[PDB]
Design a protein around this motif. Structure first.
Motif, mmCIF file in Angstrom:
data_model
loop_
_atom_site.group_PDB
_atom_site.id
_atom_site.type_symbol
_atom_site.label_atom_id
_atom_site.label_comp_id
_atom_site.label_asym_id
_atom_site.label_seq_id
_atom_site.Cartn_x
_atom_site.Cartn_y
_atom_site.Cartn_z
ATOM 1 N N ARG A 137 -18.781 38.508 26.459
ATOM 2 C CA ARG A 137 -19.602 37.931 27.515
ATOM 3 C C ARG A 137 -19.921 36.471 27.223
ATOM 4 O O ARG A 137 -20.033 35.664 28.137
ATOM 5 C CB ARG A 137 -20.892 38.741 27.683
ATOM 6 C CG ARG A 137 -21.959 38.084 28.551
ATOM 7 C CD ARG A 137 -22.999 39.106 28.976
ATOM 8 N NE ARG A 137 -23.271 40.060 27.907
ATOM 9 C CZ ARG A 137 -23.801 41.263 28.096
ATOM 10 N NH1 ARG A 137 -24.123 41.661 29.322
ATOM 11 N NH2 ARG A 137 -23.990 42.077 27.061
ATOM 12 N N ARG A 138 -20.055 36.135 25.945
ATOM 13 C CA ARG A 138 -20.356 34.767 25.543
ATOM 14 C C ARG A 138 -19.100 34.075 25.028
ATOM 15 O O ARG A 138 -19.177 33.237 24.124
ATOM 16 C CB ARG A 138 -21.414 34.758 24.433
ATOM 17 C CG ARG A 138 -22.678 35.537 24.748
ATOM 18 C CD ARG A 138 -23.497 34.885 25.850
ATOM 19 N NE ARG A 138 -24.605 35.744 26.260
ATOM 20 C CZ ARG A 138 -25.565 35.376 27.102
ATOM 21 N NH1 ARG A 138 -25.558 34.158 27.627
ATOM 22 N NH2 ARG A 138 -26.530 36.230 27.421
ATOM 23 N N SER A 139 -17.945 34.413 25.593
ATOM 24 C CA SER A 139 -16.703 33.804 25.136
ATOM 25 C C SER A 139 -16.151 32.739 26.066
ATOM 26 O O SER A 139 -16.003 32.957 27.268
ATOM 27 C CB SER A 139 -15.631 34.865 24.911
ATOM 28 O OG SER A 139 -14.441 34.258 24.433
ATOM 29 N N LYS A 140 -15.831 31.587 25.483
ATOM 30 C CA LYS A 140 -15.283 30.466 26.232
ATOM 31 C C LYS A 140 -13.763 30.429 26.119
ATOM 32 O O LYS A 140 -13.088 29.813 26.949
ATOM 33 C CB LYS A 140 -15.887 29.154 25.719
ATOM 34 C CG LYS A 140 -17.409 29.127 25.777
ATOM 35 C CD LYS A 140 -17.905 29.348 27.201
ATOM 36 C CE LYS A 140 -19.358 29.812 27.223
ATOM 37 N NZ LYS A 140 -20.292 28.861 26.556
ATOM 38 N N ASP A 155 -12.293 35.195 27.713
ATOM 39 C CA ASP A 155 -13.019 35.009 28.971
ATOM 40 C C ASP A 155 -12.341 35.788 30.096
ATOM 41 O O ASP A 155 -13.006 36.441 30.904
ATOM 42 C CB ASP A 155 -13.061 33.527 29.351
ATOM 43 C CG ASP A 155 -13.754 33.285 30.683
ATOM 44 O OD1 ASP A 155 -15.006 33.324 30.730
ATOM 45 O OD2 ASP A 155 -13.042 33.062 31.686
ATOM 46 N N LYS A 156 -11.014 35.708 30.147
ATOM 47 C CA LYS A 156 -10.254 36.413 31.169
ATOM 48 C C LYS A 156 -10.428 37.916 31.007
ATOM 49 O O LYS A 156 -10.480 38.657 31.991
ATOM 50 C CB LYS A 156 -8.774 36.058 31.067
ATOM 51 C CG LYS A 156 -7.912 36.707 32.136
ATOM 52 C CD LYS A 156 -6.471 36.217 32.062
ATOM 53 C CE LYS A 156 -5.648 36.745 33.234
ATOM 54 N NZ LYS A 156 -4.219 36.294 33.189
ATOM 55 N N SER A 163 -4.611 40.973 28.385
ATOM 56 C CA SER A 163 -5.074 40.094 29.456
ATOM 57 C C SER A 163 -4.039 39.771 30.533
ATOM 58 O O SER A 163 -4.401 39.465 31.669
ATOM 59 C CB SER A 163 -5.587 38.783 28.865
ATOM 60 O OG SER A 163 -4.554 38.108 28.173
ATOM 61 N N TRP A 201 -13.065 39.387 29.734
ATOM 62 C CA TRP A 201 -14.418 39.738 30.146
ATOM 63 C C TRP A 201 -14.515 39.918 31.658
ATOM 64 O O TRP A 201 -15.104 40.887 32.138
ATOM 65 C CB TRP A 201 -15.416 38.671 29.706
ATOM 66 C CG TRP A 201 -16.812 38.983 30.135
ATOM 67 C CD1 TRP A 201 -17.649 38.175 30.840
ATOM 68 C CD2 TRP A 201 -17.531 40.210 29.909
ATOM 69 N NE1 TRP A 201 -18.844 38.816 31.071
ATOM 70 C CE2 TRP A 201 -18.800 40.062 30.511
ATOM 71 C CE3 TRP A 201 -17.224 41.411 29.256
ATOM 72 C CZ2 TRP A 201 -19.765 41.081 30.479
ATOM 73 C CZ3 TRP A 201 -18.187 42.424 29.226
ATOM 74 C CH2 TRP A 201 -19.443 42.247 29.834
ATOM 75 N N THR A 202 -13.940 38.977 32.402
ATOM 76 C CA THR A 202 -13.962 39.041 33.859
ATOM 77 C C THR A 202 -13.440 40.401 34.306
ATOM 78 O O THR A 202 -14.035 41.061 35.159
ATOM 79 C CB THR A 202 -13.079 37.942 34.485
ATOM 80 O OG1 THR A 202 -13.595 36.652 34.131
ATOM 81 C CG2 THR A 202 -13.062 38.071 35.997
ATOM 82 N N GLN A 225 -19.144 30.812 18.551
ATOM 83 C CA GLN A 225 -18.498 29.978 19.550
ATOM 84 C C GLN A 225 -17.084 29.589 19.131
ATOM 85 O O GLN A 225 -16.433 28.776 19.780
ATOM 86 C CB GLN A 225 -19.340 28.742 19.825
ATOM 87 C CG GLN A 225 -20.447 29.041 20.795
ATOM 88 C CD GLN A 225 -21.280 27.823 21.109
ATOM 89 O OE1 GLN A 225 -22.045 27.346 20.272
ATOM 90 N NE2 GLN A 225 -21.124 27.304 22.319
#
Ligand SMILES: N[C@@H](Cc1nsnc1O)C(=O)O
Ligand SMILES: N[C@@H](Cc1nsnc1O)C(=O)O
Ligand SMILES: [Cl-]
Ligand code: NA
Ligand SMILES: [Zn+2]
Ligand SMILES: [Zn+2]
Lengths: 259, 259
Positions: free
Chosen positions: B146-149, B154-155, B126, B157-158, A242
């Motif tokens: 996929r489990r990135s905040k 996150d961008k 990105s 992954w999308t 995380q």
């Protein structure tokens, strides 16, 4: 259902006394990378804890004669502490008597010189004498050299163990100070993590030179067979994935940078 | 007592078929870092073993619907293999179902670009669309995104998950070939270890750019509860401290270098 005794060590920037510690109580007296980590592990594992600085201020080694373990390892082995949250290096001899979680930080032995010192590697140190060099008096680094079979390292060990006066220091801070006041005539072999930290602190006169001599990691330790180990191991992995660990390193190493 | 079944995967330079492999049989058909590591481990733990290439050629992931594990982890959880000696990333989801030794190698997620591609970081990828990028169809890297905040990741992954045509590849070789023949319109996200290796092989047209996106390691896995786990773990630590792992790393990555 009791408070977990956490053994740790006063080593910047892992655990440091807060400026106004004498007016604070318990865990609020400390601050640092490991203090933040401890709060996170305890939060994710669901337990109350108490931070206690290891009495003899040592990391942990077994005395050849008495066979007794000292330092943080000793506190775990003899049941004085339930867990150790500090820059405790995962090594074979330690793993044989205590449990270690997967590493929360990666590192390696490195060289710390006073800026200007004509040294770019361990090989360089071994092929000369003008510049003295040593390691912490006890711990994984000294043990590394004492056991190495690689010519360069073995040679450095032959020199260090017989050097007079002693090139070994009692604490990291003692090694850094010695580098700073030796006009460049003393180099200090310490873990890259601490080397990099000091390099960003005033008076910004030291420097990490060359590549790491090896690769290893710090792990959270618990008494052999402790029930706490499983959960704690799982928390370290989750917190790493995380990004907590990366965030904490930047916070205490670079955001606070003075150079 | 019994021959240990080792599950592994064909991934250079960990496990590769020797040139004259067709004239060879059993473990002799293979060569590589993990092949040597396996021999070493089996030597210090004292056992005979058989190297078998994982059937579906995958590292290991759990199908969200059936909840069944595939790849090397799957072979361990279902009792097909006794141990996995390969570049298998230590992660939380895997640690919940299998045992991992302490890491024998440290690494991180990295970006591979075709030389000359105007990309220096993840943030760079990105903020643009002209250059497509993705990861291995399944594995710790795809899971990381996929489990990135973290906003940047996150961008990314999308974009990747919805991208079309797919930017995910079945194997690393496929990911590498895609980068090489895409005129620089595709960047591949893979582990630093593989990236550095490829960077040193002909046609020498790829580059590892920027720093690692994270930190983690490879571990030798065993079925949860396995008896062999303890000894293997202590063996990994022993080999690392004696310098063997560092030796094998140089042997298979840089001594073989072609650029
Ligand atoms: N981390 C080491 C001590 C240490 N810190 S800097 N140089 C060293 O040897 C240990 O855990 O024993
Ligand atoms: N080592 C990863 C797979 C992998 N190799 S290069 N990039 C990747 O994602 C795994 O164990 O799932
Ligand atoms: Cl056999
Ligand atoms: Na999202
Ligand atoms: Zn050996
Ligand atoms: Zn399915």
């Amino acid at each position: 259902n009791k408070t977990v005794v956490v053994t740790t060590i006063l080593e910047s920037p892992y655990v440091m006394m807060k400026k106004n510690h004498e007016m604070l109580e318990g865990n609020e007296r400390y601050e640092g990378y490991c203090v933040d980590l401890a709060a996170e592990i305890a939060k994710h594992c669901g337990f109350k804890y108490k931070l206690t600085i290891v009495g003899d201020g040592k990391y942990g080694a077994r005395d050849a004669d008495t066979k007794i373990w000292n330092g943080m390892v000793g506190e775990l082995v003899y049941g004085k502490a339930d867990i150790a949250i500090a820059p405790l290096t995962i090594t074979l001899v330690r793993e044989e008597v205590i449990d270690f979680s997967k590493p929360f930080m990666s590192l390696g032995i490195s060289i710390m010189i006073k800026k200007g010192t004509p040294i770019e590697s361990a090989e360089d140190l071994s092929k000369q004498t003008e510049i003295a060099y040593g390691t912490l008096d006890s711990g994984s680094t000294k043990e590394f050299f004492r056991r190495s079979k690689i010519a360069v390292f073995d040679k450095m060990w032959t020199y260090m163990r017989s050097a007079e006066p002693s090139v070994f220091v009692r604490t990291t801070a003692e090694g850094v100070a010695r580098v700073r006041k030796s006009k460049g005539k003393y180099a200090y072999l310490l873990e890259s993590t601490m080397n990099e930290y000091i390099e960003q602190r005033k008076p910004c006169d030291t420097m990490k030179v060359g590549g790491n001599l090896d690769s290893k990691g710090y792990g959270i330790a618990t008494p052999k067979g402790s029930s706490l180990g499983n959960a704690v191991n799982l928390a370290v992995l989750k917190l790493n994935e995380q990004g907590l660990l990366d965030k904490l390193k930047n916070k205490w190493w670079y955001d606070k940078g003075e150079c």
